Amino acid sequence: YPSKPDNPGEDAPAEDLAQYAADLRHYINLITRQRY
Questions:
Q1: Alpha carbons 4 and 12: distance in angstroms, whole number
Q2: CA separation for the pair 31, 33 (Å, rounded)
């Protein structure tokens, strides 16, 4: 139950893992339509 969060200094995600998670999500979306 926040109201208005705000602070600097935070190693947030989406700085390299978004690419990795997406590469995996892309490869899976390929194999999904090709496997069983």
A1: 18
A2: 5
